Every structure is written in C-alpha cells, then in structure tokens.
Design an enzyme around this catalytic site. Sequence first.
Site, PDB file in Angstrom:
ATOM      1  N   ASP A 197     120.781  -9.399  30.919  1.00  0.00           N
ATOM      2  CA  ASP A 197     120.073  -9.287  32.187  1.00  0.00           C
ATOM      3  C   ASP A 197     118.752 -10.058  32.145  1.00  0.00           C
ATOM      4  OD1 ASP A 197     119.835  -8.536  34.917  1.00  0.00           O
ATOM      5  OD2 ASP A 197     118.857  -6.624  34.389  1.00  0.00           O
ATOM      6  N   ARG A 202     112.386 -11.478  36.835  1.00  0.00           N
ATOM      7  CA  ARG A 202     111.944 -10.115  37.113  1.00  0.00           C
ATOM      8  C   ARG A 202     111.835  -9.307  35.819  1.00  0.00           C
ATOM      9  NH1 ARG A 202     117.030 -10.457  39.016  1.00  0.00           N
ATOM     10  NH2 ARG A 202     118.615  -9.286  37.864  1.00  0.00           N
ATOM     11  N   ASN A 203     112.555  -9.743  34.772  1.00  0.00           N
ATOM     12  CA  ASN A 203     112.679  -8.992  33.530  1.00  0.00           C
ATOM     13  C   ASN A 203     111.870  -9.640  32.407  1.00  0.00           C
ATOM     14  OD1 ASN A 203     114.329  -6.926  34.609  1.00  0.00           O
ATOM     15  ND2 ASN A 203     116.169  -8.150  34.288  1.00  0.00           N
ATOM     16  N   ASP A 238     113.674  -5.013  29.806  1.00  0.00           N
ATOM     17  CA  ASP A 238     114.888  -4.479  30.420  1.00  0.00           C
ATOM     18  C   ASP A 238     116.095  -4.577  29.486  1.00  0.00           C
ATOM     19  OD1 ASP A 238     117.012  -3.592  32.296  1.00  0.00           O
ATOM     20  OD2 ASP A 238     115.489  -3.873  33.874  1.00  0.00           O
TER      21      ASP A 238
HETATM   22  C1  LIG Z   1     107.627  -7.050  38.840  1.00  0.00           C
HETATM   23  C2  LIG Z   1     107.197  -5.826  39.191  1.00  0.00           C
HETATM   24  C3  LIG Z   1     106.244  -5.294  38.198  1.00  0.00           C
HETATM   25  O1  LIG Z   1     106.584  -5.254  37.021  1.00  0.00           O
HETATM   26  N1  LIG Z   1     105.039  -4.883  38.766  1.00  0.00           N
HETATM   27  C4  LIG Z   1     103.922  -4.387  38.037  1.00  0.00           C
HETATM   28  C5  LIG Z   1     104.062  -4.157  36.677  1.00  0.00           C
HETATM   29  C6  LIG Z   1     103.028  -3.692  35.895  1.00  0.00           C
HETATM   30  N2  LIG Z   1     103.088  -3.446  34.514  1.00  0.00           N
HETATM   31  C7  LIG Z   1     104.159  -2.953  33.759  1.00  0.00           C
HETATM   32  N3  LIG Z   1     103.951  -2.823  32.440  1.00  0.00           N
HETATM   33  C8  LIG Z   1     104.966  -2.354  31.712  1.00  0.00           C
HETATM   34  C9  LIG Z   1     106.188  -2.011  32.249  1.00  0.00           C
HETATM   35  C10 LIG Z   1     107.206  -1.494  31.316  1.00  0.00           C
HETATM   36  O2  LIG Z   1     107.484  -2.016  30.245  1.00  0.00           O
HETATM   37  O3  LIG Z   1     107.681  -0.330  31.846  1.00  0.00           O
HETATM   38  C11 LIG Z   1     108.613   0.328  30.996  1.00  0.00           C
HETATM   39  C12 LIG Z   1     109.909   0.517  31.754  1.00  0.00           C
HETATM   40  C13 LIG Z   1     108.024   1.682  30.656  1.00  0.00           C
HETATM   41  C14 LIG Z   1     106.326  -2.175  33.624  1.00  0.00           C
HETATM   42  C15 LIG Z   1     107.492  -1.929  34.464  1.00  0.00           C
HETATM   43  C16 LIG Z   1     108.804  -1.924  34.026  1.00  0.00           C
HETATM   44  N4  LIG Z   1     109.622  -1.710  35.101  1.00  0.00           N
HETATM   45  C17 LIG Z   1     111.070  -1.639  35.028  1.00  0.00           C
HETATM   46  C18 LIG Z   1     108.874  -1.602  36.241  1.00  0.00           C
HETATM   47  C19 LIG Z   1     109.260  -1.403  37.547  1.00  0.00           C
HETATM   48  C20 LIG Z   1     108.274  -1.334  38.506  1.00  0.00           C
HETATM   49  C21 LIG Z   1     106.945  -1.455  38.166  1.00  0.00           C
HETATM   50  C22 LIG Z   1     106.575  -1.653  36.855  1.00  0.00           C
HETATM   51  C23 LIG Z   1     107.546  -1.730  35.872  1.00  0.00           C
HETATM   52  N5  LIG Z   1     105.311  -2.647  34.364  1.00  0.00           N
HETATM   53  C24 LIG Z   1     101.819  -3.479  36.499  1.00  0.00           C
HETATM   54  O4  LIG Z   1     100.809  -3.017  35.665  1.00  0.00           O
HETATM   55  C25 LIG Z   1      99.561  -3.387  36.225  1.00  0.00           C
HETATM   56  C26 LIG Z   1     101.659  -3.707  37.850  1.00  0.00           C
HETATM   57  C27 LIG Z   1     102.691  -4.162  38.653  1.00  0.00           C
HETATM   58  N6  LIG Z   1     102.387  -4.362  40.032  1.00  0.00           N
HETATM   59  C28 LIG Z   1     101.553  -3.302  40.577  1.00  0.00           C
HETATM   60  C29 LIG Z   1     103.517  -4.690  40.874  1.00  0.00           C
HETATM   61  C30 LIG Z   1     103.350  -6.137  41.281  1.00  0.00           C
HETATM   62  N7  LIG Z   1     102.705  -6.194  42.585  1.00  0.00           N
HETATM   63  C31 LIG Z   1     101.357  -6.722  42.424  1.00  0.00           C
HETATM   64  C32 LIG Z   1     103.460  -7.129  43.406  1.00  0.00           C
END
Ligand SMILES: *CCC(=O)Nc1cc(Nc2ncc(C(=O)OC(C)C)c(-c3cn(C)c4ccccc34)n2)c(OC)cc1N(C)CCN(C)C
Length: 309
Positions: free
Chosen positions: A141, A145-146, A159
Amino acid sequence: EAPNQALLRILKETEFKKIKVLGSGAFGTVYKGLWIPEGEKVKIPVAIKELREATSPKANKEILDEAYVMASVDNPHVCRLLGICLTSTVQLITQLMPFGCLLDYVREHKDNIGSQYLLNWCVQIAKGMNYLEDRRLVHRDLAARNVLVKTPQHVKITDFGLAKLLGAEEKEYHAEGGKVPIKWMALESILHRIYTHQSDVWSYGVTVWELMTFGSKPYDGIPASEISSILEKGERLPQPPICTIDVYMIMVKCWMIDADSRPKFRELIIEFSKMARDPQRYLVIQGDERMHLPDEEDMDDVVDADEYL
Ligand SMILES: *CCC(=O)Nc1cc(Nc2ncc(C(=O)OC(C)C)c(-c3cn(C)c4ccccc34)n2)c(OC)cc1N(C)CCN(C)C
C-alpha cells in the site's frame, strides 16, 4: 527461518496524554499527544490510534497485526512503533510526524517545493522500501498518502495495514478478497492478486508520479473497474510537466508488464541519488532557486522518538 526477536512494548495509559484529534474514519481516531515514561524526565511527541470507539474482533486482529509489523522494523525511512496500550480498546502508539502525510504536504506547498526536495523524497522513499525488501517485507500500500513528513528534509514510510512477511521460501503473496487501492497496483495484483517487492516498485512509480504532479489523482475520472484493460492496452500515467524525460523514464520502467524488468529499490536509490546531485538538470520548476520550506508549546524536556532508544 530466523526467529523474530522484536520487543513489543506495552505502555501505561497514564504515561501519555491525548492533546488533540488529528483524524477520523474507517480505521478509528488518530490523536497527537505526549508520552512521558515514568521518572525519566523526557517528553515524546506521539501519534495514537485507538479503534473508533468499538471492539470488532476482526478489527482488533488488524491493529495487532500492524503492531507486529511495525515492531519488526528499524530504519530511518520507516515509521517507528513506540508501543501498544491495552485499555478498553487497543491503542497503537507511534512517533508523531509533525508535517503530516506527504500527499497533503505537496498539495499545500506546491509553490514552495523545489526539485532538491522532490528528488530527496524519492531517494528516501526508495531507501525505506529497499530496507523493507531486506526484511523480506511486502508493503502492498505504498502511496503519497502513506509517507509521513517528520521534517521537510526527512520522510518515512507508514501504513503496514496490508503488509505481509514473505517466507524465505516464498517468492510472491496470493491475497484474497479485500478492498484494494486499484490505481497504485501492478497489473498482476489486479489480475491474479499476486504481490511481490516488484509490485511495490510499481506502486513506488505511482507515488513518484504523485509527487511530481504536486498531488494529482492518478487516472482522475477513470472508474476503478476498467483500469486493468487500460494497462493491458499499453496506456500509462502521463509525463508530468516538470519532469525531464530522464525522470519520466524511471516512472515508466516501474510500470513494465514484466515485473523482473522493473527497477530494484536499490537501483532507484542510485538513480535518484545521482539526480539529486544536480536537481535542475532533472526537474524543471519555475522559481526553483528562490524556494524555502520550514518548537510547539509547554516545556522543553521534549525529545523526538528518533533520540529515545
Ligand atoms: C495526510 C493526513 C495526515 O497524515 N495529516 C496529519 C498528520 C499528522 N501527523 C501524524 N503523525 C503520525 C501519524 C501516525 O504514524 O499515526 C499512527 C497511525 C499512530 C499520523 C497519522 C497516521 N494516520 C493513519 C493518520 C490519519 C489521519 C491523521 C493522522 C494520521 N499522523 C499531523 O500531525 C501534526 C497533522 C496532520 N494534519 C492535521 C492533517 C493535514 N491537514 C493539514 C491537511
């Protein structure tokens, strides 16, 4: 085969605090938070995934599978699992990647993303993948996005929802049923549900394409169900504006019907490596030279997971 002696760390729920929600959906809820191991005088920014709010024995099985994989990988270009927490619901705890996923990053920063960064991401993703291949592991995958962004300079693969460990005797992986991301997968994966390292290479190709187009949807429009015929025709994703033929040829090579014909992750490292030595010769972005990219709150006992061993 080699016994997997990875340590799975179990964390007390009192040791970490969920500071804000980051996201929600089919997977569950991801929060940002801080993990403070006891008496250690250290504060680790973390991401925390609990399973929505529910307990589906077919879902608990899946997060624990993901924990298994993540605990088995140690590489600067692969995301690190910190541990699980066994409360009402199983919680996955990982290193927070503050800049979010790379698809969203390139979408939001197109006007500031220079060829040096794009080529570096390419090297870094290839390095992670090559490591996964060493650990006999098929990701299944890989997409923009990942890939998560720790700093603009430093990305890591995430992921492991669908990742499978190949046996020392196993050459491919036959999958079953399952929803799948069609536009990122190799022809064999669509036709036969075969997945190899070389099927990941195809996905790598699509990922590179995403980066070079600043986050376009591959085959925008074309419904999932007809992609297989399109590819058998000989049709591929188009050359992105900014890409020299040198770069586009690498993408195209990732999309050969014969999987053994595609590049190996180790090779991709070398190729992009060379290009990142002279980025302007390989990516044509207007205003490339004048392009720059970017502390949180509370206290200063803060340590990134990468420095907590
Ligand atoms: C692309 C969307 C995204 O990732 N948005 C996002 C992500 C994060 N940081 C972050 N850090 C670690 C992880 C992670 O390893 O999580 C595991 C599963 C515990 C993740 C993360 C992983 N998945 C599957 C997610 C789904 C949704 C959201 C986060 C994760 N994410 C941050 O940290 C600041 C912010 C962030 N923003 C707020 C979303 C992007 N918008 C600005 C568009």
